[PDB]
């Protein structure tokens, strides 16, 4: 198990997905045209996980870029690292999806999906041992949300034994394109609960607050939020992209993180938060990554309990000190980790730090406090749905009110299920 196939869908999907390929291409010594001008052999040892080798020792991202309009994807080709992506993997429609889940899932996107699956199958075939798929998308618009979840469903049909990962950007009124976002998100969460093994919940609420409160950006752009997203994505893929004892794969992650199959919504965290000169001591990384202020999902982990945790330290540091500090927070806050999964915190260290920082920590948590996120979206949803507001946009593409009711019910069930283990 090595090769992953990456798909990015919609405005958000392709914006954050572009930053991901920018960040990791720098980490693996690949340049804006595709050539390797590195220095360490550790950079190329598992370059195969995310890149294909090409004619002339070029490395080509195993990346499929999907949108229902060409706006965002002409920007990706324009932008700093655009010329690296394989041009056949740009698969785009013309009319877009108007922030409408139904258009993504049932009408506009249905027209386009079979072409995306031909590129998926192309990349899937020239793979020694495919472990799975990761998708970047938001849940709030129509393409990345509705079409994205349509893809997932199709990929599962054709490759029912491979892993499915999402980086799924959850919406907030604090960073809001349209009033129908809670609808779109609730329709997609219903899909994600059934058809993914792992989902990283990137809440835009949490990114806005990190940007505002902790980084002193008064007027935060999507660029400022995506700076935080690509550093988190860099962190939660480190163990796949580098060595050397942890034979870490997506299946192993799924097995150890997910005690119950529907409860696979991970809260990510990063330390230190940036946009420095003083490197952080291991105690500080350990305090910071576990801090609510450093979570990429707007949930207080003190309101819930940690089912499982996976922590990843980057830089040159004492592993003695890393165990000591990781054991200190467990022993000093033991009520917040479930007694009925012994040794639920697993920690790893990797010598290569990220660009900029001498040392950093990335956190992956399956906390029951994630319910707060689904409760927040369940509330915004009901505010509108109890008066059937804005529904005509969805019923005009053939959807029924019963489908909204179903979806509202699955999410509220998810919330009940997370609440069940907080009290056990």
């Amino acid at each position: 198990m090595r090769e992953i196939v990456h798909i990015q869908a919609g405005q958000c999907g392709n914006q954050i997905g572009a930053k991901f390929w920018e960040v990791i291409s720098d980490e693996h010594g690949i340049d804006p045209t595709g050539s390797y001008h590195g220095d360490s052999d550790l950079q190329l040892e598992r370059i195969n996980v995310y890149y294909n080798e090409a004619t002339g020792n070029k490395y080509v991202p195993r990346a499929i870029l999907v949108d229902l309009e060409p706006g965002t994807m002409d920007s990706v080709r324009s932008g700093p690292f655009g010329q690296i992506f394989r041009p056949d993997n740009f698969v785009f429609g013309q009319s877009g999806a108007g922030n409408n889940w139904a258009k993504g899932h049932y009408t506009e996107g249905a027209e386009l999906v079979d072409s995306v699956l031909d590129v998926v199958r192309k990349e899937s075939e020239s793979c020694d041992c495919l472990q799975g798929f990761q998708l970047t998308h938001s849940l709030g618009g129509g393409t990345g949300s509705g079409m994205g979840t349509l893809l997932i469903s199709k990929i599962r049909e054709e490759y029912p034994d491979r892993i499915m990962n999402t980086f799924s950007v959850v919406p907030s009124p604090k960073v809001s394109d349209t009033v129908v976002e809670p609808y779109n998100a609730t329709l997609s969460v219903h899909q994600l609960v059934e058809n993914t093994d792992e989902t990283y919940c990137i809440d835009n609420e949490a990114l806005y607050d990190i940007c505002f409160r902790t980084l002193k950006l008064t007027t935060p752009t999507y660029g400022d939020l995506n700076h935080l997203v690509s550093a988190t994505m860099s962190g939660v893929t480190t163990c796949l992209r580098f060595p050397g004892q942890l034979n870490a794969d997506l299946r192993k992650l799924a097995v150890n993180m997910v005690p119950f199959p529907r409860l696979h919504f991970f809260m990510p965290g990063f330390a230190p938060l940036t946009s420095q000169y003083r490197a952080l001591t291991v105690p500080e990384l350990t305090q910071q990554m576990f801090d609510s202020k450093n979570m990429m999902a707007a949930c207080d982990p003190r309101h819930g309990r940690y089912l499982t945790v996976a922590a990843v330290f980057r830089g040159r540091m004492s592993m003695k000190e890393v165990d000591e500090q990781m054991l200190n927070v467990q022993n000093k806050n033991s009520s917040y980790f479930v007694e009925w999964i012994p040794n639920n915190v697993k920690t790893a260290v990797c010598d290569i730090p990220p660009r900029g920082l001498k040392m950093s920590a990335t956190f992956i948590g399956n906390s029951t406090a994630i319910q707060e996120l689904f409760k927040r979206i369940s509330e915004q949803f009901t505010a509108m749905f109890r008066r059937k507001a804005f529904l005509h946009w969805y019923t005009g593409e053939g959807m029924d009110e019963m489908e909204f009711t179903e979806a509202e019910s699955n999410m509220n069930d998810l919330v009940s299920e997370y609440q069940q283990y907080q009290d056990a």
């Binding site: 198990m1 020694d128 041992c129 004892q245 942890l246 034979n247 794969d249 299946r251 192993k252 799924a254 097995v255 150890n256 005690p259 119950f260 199959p261 499982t308 004492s318 592993m319 003695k320 165990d323 007694e339 009925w340 999964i341 012994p342 040794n343 639920n344 697993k346 283990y421 056990a424």
Partner: protein, 437 residues
Amino acid sequence: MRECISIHVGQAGVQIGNACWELYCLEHGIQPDGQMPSDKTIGGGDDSFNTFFSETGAGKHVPRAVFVDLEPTVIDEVRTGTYRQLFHPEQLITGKEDAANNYARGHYTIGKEIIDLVLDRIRKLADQCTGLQGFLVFHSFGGGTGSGFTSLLMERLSVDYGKKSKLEFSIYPAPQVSTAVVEPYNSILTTHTTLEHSDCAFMVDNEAIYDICRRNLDIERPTYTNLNRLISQIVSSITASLRFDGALNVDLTEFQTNLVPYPRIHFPLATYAPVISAEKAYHEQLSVAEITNACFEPANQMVKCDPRHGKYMACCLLYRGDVVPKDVNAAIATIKTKRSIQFVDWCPTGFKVGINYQPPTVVPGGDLAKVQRAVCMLSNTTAIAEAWARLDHKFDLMYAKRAFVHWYVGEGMEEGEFSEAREDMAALEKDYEEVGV
């Protein structure tokens, strides 16, 4: 002589085999290409070391070893590494997809598709043997392959070679170094399915070995390299009598007869001394009395537990180096008057001693210091059930909530096999308690 086949399954089994076979080669004077200058019968022999090595007409000495991993990366390091020419490609078996820390994936799913390839390569070695005794199996309790694929192999080895002895070398899981949360499920699952098929099993608790490395070798944070090099000295102590001239534990049946009167209770506690740092400038060499006494300290055991609050059914002192009978008896005399060494009413309170004059060999540029004398005590004490109770509690905790169970079921297994396995262990713990009080 009668030949022995070593089988190494999973990362843990394979890396520990590497460490053992390296050490075996240094001990017998065999070199990385397979040449053994001191051997004069070229192309064959029935010497003690031939139990573990075969010979080619070119003069190469070849392990009676099979390495098996469901994924290639760890066995690739044997293929491309310092002892690459030592092994024959057909001895080294790899898949493409590991068991993902899941007993049931390694046993039922990925197991099924490779069991016939492995048993065929085992038969290729068995058919070079004039009188096979049986098997030494190396594996982890906690890995998906180590647990899951091992237990299917043990089931088949009983069917295909029913008259032969099977010894287990087993790594009991330790949270300090453990890369998975479901090892308690994997360990109880494999222990149940393997119990009737193993004749004698030596548990090694990574916790114990890791603390031995911190405390006695001054290693800040022990790697697998550190743990394994220490484990191979212990393994080597135990298997030396199969590879050298002597009259104790000369075949695999004698391990069972000396160490295992009641056959389900077949988990002997290994204790080992002395472990001394190669970076220690000044070391006062320890005597027979001192190191025989070190064998009744819990801090030197392979599993942490308290033999004082238990009973022995057998003890075996395996000395290496400058030791003579009368020094051992004088040490045994002293120790009996101090310590709590209560035996079971039906067994003779005694010790079977074995001494080999050649002192322990150590890997050059390794962590262990060369010593004038070392000893490995093999005692079947009821105190080792402490290890089962801990592992059983951790299983109870997770299983009450059905946590992670769905991953196993999804590979075809039945929720029933969990409580079935756990009831056998419940019975196992109750057997130890009868004998022990």
